[PDB]
Amino acid sequence: SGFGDKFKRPVGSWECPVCCVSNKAEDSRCVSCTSEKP
Amino acid sequence: PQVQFKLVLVGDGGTGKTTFVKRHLTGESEKKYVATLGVEVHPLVFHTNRGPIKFNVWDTAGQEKFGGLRDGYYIQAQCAIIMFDVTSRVTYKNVPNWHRDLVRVCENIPIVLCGNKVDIKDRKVKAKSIVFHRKKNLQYYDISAKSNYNFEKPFLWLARKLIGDPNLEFVAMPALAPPEVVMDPALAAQYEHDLEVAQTTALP
Ligand SMILES: Nc1nc2c(ncn2[C@@H]2O[C@H](COP(=O)(O)OP(=O)(O)O)[C@@H](O)[C@H]2O)c(=O)[nH]1
Ligand SMILES: [Mg+2]
Ligand SMILES: [Zn+2]
């Protein structure tokens, strides 16, 4: 079975637009590159 | 949402990390520059029998030449490649350091060890010398970035570990830059026969 069938981003998470790391909802900045939650 | 993994590509300067990640043509044309860290993130899509998998490969701007890498580089890495140069014994001796630096932040993420530049005749680090992966039960592969030799092997191993599916296959190779050097098919078979023999030899 395909991953996309059973893959879902954690509730509230956001992908960093600069470096693509997945961050927690409560994080205002990217825990990797420090860029801001857009 | 897409299945993507942050893959950190570490190793001594001059080992060929940038030449390697650049082989994936779409990852190169769609790489993203991270100013704050001086990093380029290459989106390397691979197409598996179960769907697309994207390795966001982090490549340095050469800062590894002047010291270790900052936390931010390693933070949230889900897998890694440690590269060394089979023509520079010293790069192989720094593999443990890179390993330590990496596990200090990321813990037991899947890791593949790659010896680059095996297209060169005067190979200094032979199969019998490469033992670090066996000590830490990592996977090793010979590669040649400039010939695309074994380019897909590290990513296939990682995808299988990350997905938990050992039957996972790449249904088609990604579009790669044309080989800039030829890799003698026999030399490749001989090197592959040297690894299996070295695999059946005791650890000193
Ligand atoms: N024969 C051969 N030369 C390579 C290969 N990969 C890199 N080189 C060269 O090794 C030098 C360093 O390359 P680079 O990718 O910048 O290493 P990095 O510092 O780890 O990013 C360059 O002169 C490359 O042309 C390879 O696979 N085979
Ligand atoms: Mg480089
Ligand atoms: Zn980021």
Swiss-Prot record, chain A:
Signal peptide: none
Sequence positions that bind Zn(2+) 3: 16, 19, 30, 33
Post-translational modification: Phosphorylated in interphase, hyperphosphorylated during mitosis. May play a role in the reversible disassembly of the nuclear pore complex during mitosis. O-glycosylated during cytokinesis at sites identical or close to phosphorylation sites, this interferes with the phosphorylation status.
Compartments where found: Nucleus; Nucleus membrane; Nucleus, Nuclear pore complex
ZnF (RanBP2-type) intervals: 10-38
Sequence repeats by residue range: 3-4
Quaternary structure annotation from Swiss-Prot or TrEMBL: Part of the nuclear pore complex (NPC). Interacts with TPR (via coiled coil region); the interaction is direct and provides a link between the core structure and the TPR-containing nuclear basket of the nuclear pore complex (NPC). Interacts with HIKESHI. Interacts with SENP2. Interacts with XPO5. Interacts with RAN; the interaction occurs in a GTP- and GDP-independent manner. Interacts with MCM3AP; this interaction is required for MCM3AP localization at the nuclear pore complex. Interacts with MAPK1.
Family according to the record: Belongs to the NUP153 family.
Entry remark concerning the domains of this protein: Contains FG repeats. FG repeats are interaction sites for karyopherins (importins, exportins) and form probably an affinity gradient, guiding the transport proteins unidirectionally with their cargo through the NPC. FG repeat regions are highly flexible and lack ordered secondary structure. The overall conservation of FG repeats regarding exact sequence, spacing, and repeat unit length is limited.
Function: Component of the nuclear pore complex (NPC), a complex required for the trafficking across the nuclear envelope. Functions as a scaffolding element in the nuclear phase of the NPC essential for normal nucleocytoplasmic transport of proteins and mRNAs. Involved in the quality control and retention of unspliced mRNAs in the nucleus; in association with TPR, regulates the nuclear export of unspliced mRNA species bearing constitutive transport element (CTE) in a NXF1- and KHDRBS1-independent manner. Mediates TPR anchoring to the nuclear membrane at NPC.
Listed name of the protein: Nuclear pore complex protein Nup153
Species of the source: Rattus norvegicus
Gene that specifies this protein: Nup153
Full protein segment contained here: 781 to 817 of 1468
UniProtKB/Swiss-Prot annotation, chain B:
Tissues expressed in: Expressed in a variety of tissues.
Residues bearing PTM N6-acetyllysine: 31, 54, 65, 93, 128, 153
Modified residues (Phosphothreonine): 18
Top-rank EC class of the record's enzyme: hydrolase
Effect of residue 33 to A: Abolishes steric hindrance that traps the essential Q-63 in an unreactive position, and causes slow GTP hydrolysis in wild-type. Loss of one hydrogen bond with the gamma phosphate group of bound GTP
GO MF annotation: an example: GTP binding
Gene name linked to the record: RAN
Protein name: GTP-binding nuclear protein Ran
PANTHER family reported for this sequence: GTP-BINDING NUCLEAR PROTEIN RAN (PTHR24071:SF0), RAN GTPASE (PTHR24071)
